[PDB]
């Protein structure tokens, strides 16, 4: 309710209690939804005073009020977070992590999560100021359940921001130091802790195979497959993103997901009413069908081919594009028998209907798949049989009409098939 000018008068007074009320009043201003006047605050020069109040051990209320005020400034645009870091806030908040007052160390956790959240450079600067050790020491209890729920969720969220962002990814040793506490939060029974722990693991598996390995080595894949089955969307979404990332790795890393039971969840995932879940599940499936023949066989055995035919036939267009990738990866690496099977499941007609989409990328993918499938057919003498099938469902009209397509890759490929097999 105070004007900024009054808060400035209060803060510049020489009177700690007057500075306290004025800081509280700033906190309340900055605590309202409809555009808190952050820039006004910054422009009055208040950040350096808030930061020096962070160090007032004798006046824990002004530590709390200023922590909160700065939390909210640091929650704004990059320029606003930078004004907080530029005021010296980072080591001051890290020292508040050891405060005996739980509400004050929690406010310091939160503020550091906002600063780390702005991007790679500030995340790495938080880390270089030594935030990780006193953060992890707040969770060094025998049973996470004895911590206050809100307090535990804030910690988990700030730790997930320390795992987030990519160019560069977090330092390898900081990831190693954080991982065991993260594996433990991933077994915790609060849905928001679980969601954010899963997000963190999704960020850490989003990168080169060496990064995936450090996570998989910690034996989290079975817990991730279990979370894949949760009823809470906010948990399924990151658990599936993490699983999808792990199967972009090596064949051995892909195999840990299959052995953990993940494929049995895909009938639901591939039909999930949330379109982003269907899209990410089909993308994951495309990377599994880019696997070894024995892994492709597991996809067969789990009955997932008819589910791929399903999403190819009807899904959001972005999912259908993933289904087309899953098919052309399957047909490039599968045995003749796995490829025949795919056709017996009814792949050909939805594949041909997608030759009508005005998306140049999907067209090449589908044409590569057809080529692969003809390839298997030749190996069996069936080119003819397959060729009529393609014709009867109207697929020859599509391949033919694609030679009037001013993408050279497209109508080169079409022409190629239009003679070679027709």
């Amino acid at each position: 309710n105070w004007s900024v000018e009054d808060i400035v008068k209060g803060i510049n007074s020489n009177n700690l209690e007057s500075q306290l009320q004025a800081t509280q009043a700033a906190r309340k201003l900055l605590s309202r939804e409809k555009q808190p006047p952050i820039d006004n605050i910054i422009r009055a020069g208040l950040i350096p005073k808030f930061v020096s109040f962070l160090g007032k051990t004798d006046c824990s209320p002004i530590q709390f009020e200023s922590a909160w005020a700065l939390t909210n400034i640091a929650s704004g645009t990059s320029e606003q977070t930078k004004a907080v870091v530029d005021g010296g806030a980072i080591p001051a908040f890290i020292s508040l992590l050891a405060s005996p007052h739980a509400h004050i160390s929690e406010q310091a956790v939160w503020a550091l999560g906002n600063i780390a959240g702005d991007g790679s450079a500030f995340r790495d600067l938080v880390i270089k100021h030594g935030a990780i050790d006193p953060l992890l020491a707040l969770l060094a209890v025998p049973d996470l359940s004895t911590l206050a729920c809100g307090y535990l969720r804030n910690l988990t969220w700030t730790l997930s921001n320390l795992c987030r962002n990519k160019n560069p990814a977090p330092p390898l040793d900081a990831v190693e130091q954080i991982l065991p506490t993260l594996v433990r939060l991933l077994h915790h029974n609060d849905p928001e802790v679980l969601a954010d722990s899963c997000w963190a693991i999704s960020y850490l598996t989003d990168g080169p195979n060496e990064r995936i390995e450090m996570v998989v080595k910690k034996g989290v894949v079975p817990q991730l497959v279990k979370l894949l089955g949760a009823t809470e969307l906010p948990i399924v979404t990151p658990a599936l993103r993490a699983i999808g990332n792990i199967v972009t790795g090596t064949d051995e890393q892909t195999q840990k997901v299959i052995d953990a039971g993940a494929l049995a969840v895909f009938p639901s995932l591939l039909t999930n009413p949330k379109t982003n879940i269907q899209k990410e599940a089909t993308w994951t499936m495309s990377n599994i069908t880019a696997g070894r023949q024995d892994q492709i066989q597991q996809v067969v055995n789990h009955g997932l081919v008819p589910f791929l035919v399903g999403v190819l036939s009807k899904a959001d267009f972005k999912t259908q594009k993933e289904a087309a990738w899953a098919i052309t990866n399957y047909t490039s690496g599968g045995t003749v028998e796995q490829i025949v099977y795919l056709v017996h499941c009814g792949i050909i007609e939805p594949l041909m209907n997608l030759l009508s989409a005005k998306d140049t990328k999907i067209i090449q993918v589908i044409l590569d798949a057809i080529s692969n499938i003809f390839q298997a057919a030749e190996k069996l003498g069936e080119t003819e049989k397959l060729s009529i099938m393609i014709e009867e469902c109207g697929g020859l009209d599509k391949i033919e009409a694609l030679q009037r397509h001013e993408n050279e890759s497209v109508y080169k490929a079409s022409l190629n098939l239009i003679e070679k097999y027709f």
């Binding site: 605590s31 808190p36 939390t71 909210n72 929650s75 906002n114 989003d206 990332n245 790795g249 993308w283």
Partner: peptide
Amino acid sequence: LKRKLKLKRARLAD
């Protein structure tokens, strides 16, 4: 052929 939650949060009133 493999193919590879909220950044910042204000504390509201309270």
